[PDB]
Amino acid sequence: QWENSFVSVYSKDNPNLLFNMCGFECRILPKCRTSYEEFTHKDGVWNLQNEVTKERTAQCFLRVDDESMQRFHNRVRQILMASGSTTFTKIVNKWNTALIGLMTYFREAVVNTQELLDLLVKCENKIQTRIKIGLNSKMPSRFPPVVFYTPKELGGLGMLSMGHVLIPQSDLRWSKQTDVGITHFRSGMSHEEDQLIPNLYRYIQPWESEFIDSQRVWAEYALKRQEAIAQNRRLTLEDLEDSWDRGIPRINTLFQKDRHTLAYDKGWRVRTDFKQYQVLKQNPFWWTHQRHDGKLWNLNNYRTDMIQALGGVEGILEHTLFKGTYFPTWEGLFWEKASGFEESMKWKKLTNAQRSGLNQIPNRRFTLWWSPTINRANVYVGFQVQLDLTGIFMHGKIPTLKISLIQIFRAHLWQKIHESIVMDLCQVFDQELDALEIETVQKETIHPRKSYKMNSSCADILLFASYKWNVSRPSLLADSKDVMDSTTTQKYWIDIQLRWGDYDSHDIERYARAKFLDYTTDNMSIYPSPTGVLIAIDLAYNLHSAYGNWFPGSKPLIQQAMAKIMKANPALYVLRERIRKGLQLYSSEPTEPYLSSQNYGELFSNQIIWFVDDTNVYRVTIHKTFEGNLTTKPINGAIFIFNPRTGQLFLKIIHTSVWAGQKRLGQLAKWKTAEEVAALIRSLPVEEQPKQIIVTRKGMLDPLEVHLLDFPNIVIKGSELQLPFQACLKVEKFGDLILKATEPQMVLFNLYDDWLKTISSYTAFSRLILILRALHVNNDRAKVILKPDKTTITEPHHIWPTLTDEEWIKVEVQLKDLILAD
Amino acid sequence: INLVSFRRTIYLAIQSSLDFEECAHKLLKMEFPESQTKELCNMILDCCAQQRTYEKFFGLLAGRFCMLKKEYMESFEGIFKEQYDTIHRLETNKLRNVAKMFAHLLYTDSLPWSVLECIKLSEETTTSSSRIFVKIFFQELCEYMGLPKLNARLKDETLQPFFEGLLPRDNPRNTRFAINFFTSIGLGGLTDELREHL
Amino acid sequence: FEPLVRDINLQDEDWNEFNDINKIIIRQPIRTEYKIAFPYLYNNLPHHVHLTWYHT
């Protein structure tokens, strides 16, 4: 190409030498012809040794790579720019992936010139700033280095950056003409406070390490194979003790099975260059295929020592990891890691809404996974927010906070969680009226805006004492023992509060104490007398305390009451329940005591146990109109609770009036069913409230867990059993009854009839179920069979016809073999 | 605790900040007192030999570091004297790194002074670690250190009479065993003084 | 402020060798405050500059 081509001719006039050979370019100068000082070996230089003279003949400093410079900058330009909405995890995986590919072999080539190294600041700057653009934040204080880098499941994107560095720029153009000096090198990292990140360049192997590596290692394997050839074979673990990982020609690679035995003589460079110029794209292969060569890029101390430089457990404490890990304290060992990549999605390419919603959760997982972004108060445009009916402090991204946090908080029931902790203290205090001689203890009216106002105080419950609460300084709950004055006036009443924010920086002492002295100093709402007890709790990392007066019979009382109550609260059951539900990553324990076998025998004794199948709550009629479109019109459903011992069946019918105006009717059937079951439980006096509830669906499990928080005695469990309440339904009862149902109403049903008199509840239960799946397949032939004689009749007030026990047995055999036939 | 955290930050910044010659601004920016200077030199050598391979950045950081102040090069002389007491206590793979760093600083010769006298143990008394490492550092330091000017200039520097095993003439085992070990290690004509003197 | 009139870089191999010298006098490391108050000390881009207030 003439002028486009480059060449260099060394001679007596040219003091040094150079060339463009291979990538980047090369330079060398002899140590004898160098007049100034001697050869200075620091970073970019190289040792040129003469094997004939057995010494270092010259010093070779080569170059940086301009074509690879613009190739990496353009590779990140099309990489990040061509990448649209998607999970930042894989985005940083390809980012740091290919960036490490260009950083695979750099050493003195990239370390020499600072211009190529300066592009990495724009690389990582546009990377973390690109993820911040995806979060619609772009705030430096909202994304410290903690969320920038972390390996594996630690919560970080896994980006490996060599940001924290200062290029050796000295004396500007004066040194551009001088080319000798080191002073005032660049600036530093992007944002670093009293800390320095790791560097892959310092953790990589220089070309000299490959020189001496393959040299001394080539002599070790050389003489080893020599003496093995002259003497006997002796091929054993000694080669593994020879450090086969040293050098690019790794001995472990040539000693493999498919490598030495398989493949072939001609190397893989053919498909390397050719295929690199072929197919649909190229790749970052600077040496050879993984089969022909290897033992080059190994994380090791990069990820290990990276987590070592990271805060580790302290870093998770600075993040929201340990916050949601409060109740699952054993989750700190990274047991279940994460899951749910495929989930229910069909293949990969799908509708744009299914792809955006598919990338929603992981973006929301990494978004809501870091609280301090929307929690820790920052400068500039940071503003106050009220969230939804709970509270908020710092502003931030709309989808993270509102979308993810509202889904984690579920419905307004969080107010019933606060009132569930207050009522949990009121009901948790019983012997205190006898011990403290409380004259009158009455819970104050709980307003919906009282617990929702973070500025003002909160009224919990009212109590009394013989004289009054004995105490002097209303310090915090964690305060040490101090002299307690009497100061008896009238009475006292405990208060409560909660804080869902302040991930990184939070203090229950200063904020609880100073908050009680603040709201108590001014006049907003004061439930107790001027001498009283005020309790303040924080939802972050399961924090609880009290800023009120600590009495000798109060501080230990509410102390241990907050030890067990704060240990497991119903509101804390919703905290770990909805917490881990929103995480959907690490679950170290399964559910329990899910019904399997012994629950059938325990279903008939003297306890509770309810079977709830909502499958038929949602029923529709799909009819295609002749325009070519489907019209779906919902019809009335029903909600089911069955008693195995007594055969008592509960009927709650759902109507198109409450099916009207809403959407997502399956999930709405879940929440509506669980809410109605909760109301019925509240309506069947505590004796008629169940001990356990058996359901057939996890979509039954979660909403019941949400609505049932106010009765901790109730235990929720799932089951795989098959109960065609649908078959029965149509059959006779809800064919006529749901077909005719004009509105929601409720009726007590006995499905065993006289079986309880004739037979045991277990025989009625198993016979019941077998005859149920019967009532499907033979519902068809149960409407055939169940009247074996012409005079067989069903009484109007029973479920079943009257038959002799032998005929019942015949029905058992016929319908059981039916179930076997399917 | 102070040396554990100081070694954690020194190792964190050691594994980071490529071209450690620039990292000396951060190492000196730590502002460690004189009590942490000796422990920073010993732990600095521990991090130098803790790598999976010999790194020239450790030799440069030791050359500029020890070459900074007087107590620095002094800490390199005393720390090198304490390093000479390792012998068989040093690791086999780390012996090559100690020979590469000691050979790099010995090639410059600035900070080390009496290190040439502390070496060269007796004829038949050795741990083979200082003999093998002395052969590796003697071959590499002979190649890159200008062996003809290093041995010829070292003959008039009074380093040989200050060393026990390098003493020619009187002691027959020192000069003879030094000629057999030197000539057997590849010194060639460098042992002719002990050969003719013996 | 900004680079102002300067775009990125403008130089020449023959102009730099004529203006500067590989071997020259070295006394002080080119104090910027000396060139600030002395527009003749810094000849790079002397266009639209209000300066040279002598002493007090």
């Binding site: 300066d118 600041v121 724009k122 700057n125 940001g163 200062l166 720029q169 000295s170 004396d171 500007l172 004066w174 040194s175 080191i182 002073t183 005032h184 090198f185 660049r186 600036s187 530093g188 990292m189 992007s190 944002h191 | 010659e21 620039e22 000396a24 601004h25 190492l27 000196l28 920016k29 500029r64 070459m67 900074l68 | 900004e2 680079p3 300067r6 490391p29 080119i30 104090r31 910027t32």
Partner: peptide, 30 residues
């Protein structure tokens, strides 16, 4: 742009690295 070193655009890349002289530049100068 200080004497001998500076970045025309401080907003150009990351943040202005408050460089000094490096505890090693004095060692190389002495």
């Amino acid at each position: 742009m200080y004497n001998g070193i500076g970045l025309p655009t401080p907003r150009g890349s990351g943040t202005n690295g408050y460089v000094q002289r490096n505890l090693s530049l004095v060692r190389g100068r002495r």
